[PDB]
């Protein structure tokens, strides 16, 4: 299964800059974005483990200047129930 890298920012501008600097700094796939309400938006990139790790470590470094970065996380091998339950880019 492909990996997972999520950046949750309070603000759409920080999420767009995060999701831009993640795809400019690795070979990942920006599959979408999640709007959990109250200003919190989460950008999701997906690919092999070192690429999404470098992508989140660049997207955090880019989005802290233009917003409020709340969460930065990488899951290297998510279980298939997460991809089959949550809208995270690998729903069969």
């Amino acid at each position: 299964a492909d990996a997972l890298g999520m950046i949750e920012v309070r603000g759409f501008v920080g999420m767009v800059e995060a999701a831009d600097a993640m795809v400019k700094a690795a070979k990942v796939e920006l599959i979408g974005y999640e709007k959990t309400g109250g200003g919190y938006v989460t950008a999701v990139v997906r690919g092999d483990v070192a690429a999404v790790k470098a992508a989140t470590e660049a997207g955090q470094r880019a989005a802290e200047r233009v917003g409020e970065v709340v969460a930065v996380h990488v899951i290297p091998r998510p279980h298939v129930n997460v991809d089959a339950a949550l809208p995270l880019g690998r729903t069969p």
Partner: protein, 202 residues
């Protein structure tokens, strides 16, 4: 004055291949030992090289004279030959083992996911393996210039990276590496752990 005295106890294949690609001398093969000596001033190594060639079975590759940075690589399979050539070089210079300058790391930078336009500039001005667009890039400067080949040797020996360019001469030693991100991280760890684990005069 002895700037760099480093003994590469085994030449890993991309390093020996890259040295044999830009050798003004006899070409080395992988698996051999190696010795790099960089001194100040430069022309005196024209004597010193000859002393090593009168002493041992070693066989030189790169010998650069620039009146402030002499250089000499000598390589042979038997590591006793290369160590005795090192003792001959240090006796001709009348210096010691610890008289070498301790290498310091000036700048290490990892430039992950290089765009293609930068890869054109990097591979046109290099000789090693080509950098592909999207691969990472580890650049390095060491003081003095001679320890960059040591950094390249241990970085190849640890990780699975592509040797792009190394510069054992000049004011400071440059090193370029390419490959996937985790292998570039492991090679960066190898180069940093290999440079500052060298005893010498600060």
């Amino acid at each position: 004055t002895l700037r760099t005295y480093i003994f590469l106890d085994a030449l890993q294949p991309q390093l020996a291949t890259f040295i044999g690609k830009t050798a003004r001398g006899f070409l080395p093969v992988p698996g051999q030992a190696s010795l790099w000596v960089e001194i100040a001033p430069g022309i005196a190594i024209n004597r010193v090289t000859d002393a090593a060639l009168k002493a041992t079975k070693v066989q030189p590759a790169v010998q650069v004279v620039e009146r402030a940075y002499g250089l000499l690589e000598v390589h042979h399979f038997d590591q006793g030959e290369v160590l005795a050539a090192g003792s001959t070089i240090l006796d001709k210079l009348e210096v010691r083992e610890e008289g070498r300058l301790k290498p310091q790391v000036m700048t290490h930078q990892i430039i992950r996911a290089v765009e293609a336009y930068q890869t054109q500039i990097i591979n046109r001005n290099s000789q090693g393996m080509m950098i592909l667009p999207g691969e990472s890039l580890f650049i390095l400067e060491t003081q003095p210039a001679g320890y960059a080949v040591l950094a390249a040797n241990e970085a190849e020996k640890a990780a699975n990276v592509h040797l792009v360019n190394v510069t054992p001469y000049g004011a400071f030693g440059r090193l370029y590496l390419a490959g996937s991100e985790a292998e570039i991280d492991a090679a960066a760890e190898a180069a940093e752990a290999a440079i500052r684990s060298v005893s010498g005069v600060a």
